[PDB]
Design a protein around this ligand. Structure first.
Ligand SMILES: N=C(NCCCSC[C@H]1O[C@@H](n2cnc3c(N)ncnc32)[C@H](O)[C@@H]1O)Nc1cccc(-c2ccc(Cl)cc2)c1
Ligand SMILES: N=C(NCCCSC[C@H]1O[C@@H](n2cnc3c(N)ncnc32)[C@H](O)[C@@H]1O)Nc1cccc(-c2ccc(Cl)cc2)c1
Lengths: 301, 301
């Protein structure tokens, strides 16, 4: 309902220019097509789709931001092409049987935390025509090892001496909370490992709960204090100009930053070591169970 | 209920060292006294009060953080002195008739936004002994003129061109929202003006809704784009070592930062000009009505 969410998303240039570049550089995907923008917000993606030659764009949003979108569409003289519908995409009546293309920015922290993927897959199954397309079409989640004894002390050991008083019992409440924040790439001590690969054409809501063994190729002898998670978004199907962006620490900052799982017990690793563990994501809000160096912890965000 | 609020408050050194210094440098205020900590959190102020020679400290908190406080008090071997009570200070039964000293950190953004002052004044009226003391005892709110055409363009004019599309109608929704953020002291273009003076010994919840004429002595010929608000906290009554801290832009950053009211229509001012306006605060959440250069706007936070 709040303009603040839409301001931060629109001011993320990696995000918004990626969608803009996909749409403007692949207009053959949109030309004379019926396009559904799931959770359209201000209507920015509906308007990209219209300028790329869409026959009809249906922007749907459940929130009061749609009333801003109605006015914005009119200011840009696209009400001829873009029809806006207020309500849950699961609930509303659409004035078409079927759509050629679905577009959405559905992605949460660590891809899946408080994500809309559920609503997009509903829209796909209800409304996507035989041989239609969904964008972005491919997503991955990666983990990477971190060494940052200073940031670990600042969040954990901090509680041992607070202006002369012991507050040690507070550490049990901090460890299980994933942190969202921009990591210094200098603190990465492994190659990343892919733990999940989603093609939005072939996935179901049940595929989004997963387990993966992983191996982190250690590149620096150090104390491992944390595992960081991020995701890569690809526009591929039928593209003459493929688009990708990363939310990883070695790439430009996005409003997603990185998701960080602090280790209760940091442990030493050696350059050339293959660090083996297991990660499981449950949908329930989202939880991440991490097994590493013969201990297991469950995190939430 | 969440550790995150308490972490940010405890890591604010201006805040926490101010309370620590008041209590440790004025132990004659606490010696053999019965002390009530309203909204005690982790119990940090209860423990300061105990080390300064308190006969009995009653820490009261409505939230689950009290269960952490019960353990923390035990880790520091002060359960002899500090009794912790779970519930609203308005509701709970205290094991005393009366208290000598009330201590609290009740202060919101711009002092009064989502502040606990209501609950402390209830505690004062119910439980403060004849000739008892409340700390901090004196608070002020100040306004100051700002020139920052770049930050104003980044929040307002931004909406006129969003990746080639007009979103101008969004400005009406942004202007009425106070911003909390740390100002560059280089962007201040007036002496501050005091608009409110609270002595917690002599105020009532009705005094917290106020109107004030103000005069801002302009120090730099410029465009005025915003009015900023902040507050100063004083520990005075019976102190051999008075303590004060500011949340103003010319002082060290606190977790309160500054509250900024963006002007819909920036206007030019001349060094030596006495800029006259009127501010009114209503309790309702909090609203701030501002009259300046012959236009009025109501803000919320
Ligand atoms: N970028 C994000 N994309 C996820 C998705 C973000 S809502 C996108 C839009 O869809 C709407 N909608 C949702 N479910 C719907 C439904 N079933 N049917 C119809 N509409 C539906 C909804 O009203 C909204 O307008 N996520 C996100 C992740 C991390 C941080 C932030 C963030 C950052 C900064 C701030 Cl200040 C606030 C938030 C945002
Ligand atoms: N520093 C602040 N002090 C105001 C007050 C802050 S609660 C203090 C404590 O009193 C409790 N309580 C409240 N009403 C009560 C009652 N009637 N009876 C009994 N207990 C009561 C409550 O459970 C809590 O534990 N405010 C504040 C202002 C601006 C920003 C932030 C902030 C910054 C960062 C983050 Cl991550 C989160 C929040 C905090």
């Amino acid at each position: 309902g709040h303009y603040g969410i839409h301001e931060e998303m629109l001011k993320d240039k990696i995000r918004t220019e990626s969608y803009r570049d996909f749409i403007y550089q692949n207009p053959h995907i949109f030309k004379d097509k019926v396009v559904l923008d799931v959770g359209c917000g201000t209507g920015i993606l509906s308007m990209f789709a219209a300028k790329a030659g869409a026959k009809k764009v249906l922007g749907v949003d459940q929130s009061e931001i749609l009333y801003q979108a109605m006015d914005i569409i009119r200011l840009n003289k696209l009400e001829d092409t873009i029809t806006l519908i207020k309500g849950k995409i699961e609930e509303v009546h659409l004035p078409v049987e079927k759509v050629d293309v679905i577009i959405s920015e559905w992605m949460g922290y660590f891809l899946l935390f408080e994500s809309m993927l559920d609503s997009v897959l509903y829209a796909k199954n209800k409304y996507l025509a035989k041989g239609g397309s969904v964008y972005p079409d491919i997503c991955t989640i990666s983990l990477v090892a971190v060494s940052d004894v200073n940031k670990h002390a600042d969040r954990i050991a901090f509680w041992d001496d607070v202006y002369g008083f012991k507050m040690s019992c507070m550490k049990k409440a901090v460890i299980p909370e994933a942190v969202v924040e921009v990591l210094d790439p200098k603190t990465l001590i492994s190659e990343p490992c892919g733990i999940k690969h989603i093609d939005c054409h072939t996935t179901s809501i049940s595929d989004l709960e997963f387990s993966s063994d992983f191996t982190l190729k250690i590149t620096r002898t150090s104390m491992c204090t944390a595992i960081a998670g991020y995701f890569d978004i690809y526009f591929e199907k039928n593209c003459h100009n493929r688009v990708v962006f990363s939310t990883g620490p070695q790439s430009t900052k996005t409003h997603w930053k990185q998701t960080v799982f602090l280790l209760e017990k940091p442990f030493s690793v050696k350059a050339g070591e293959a660090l083996k563990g297991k990660v499981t994501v449950h949908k329930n809000s989202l939880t991440v169970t991490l097994t590493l160096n013969n201990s297991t912890q469950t995190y939430g965000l």
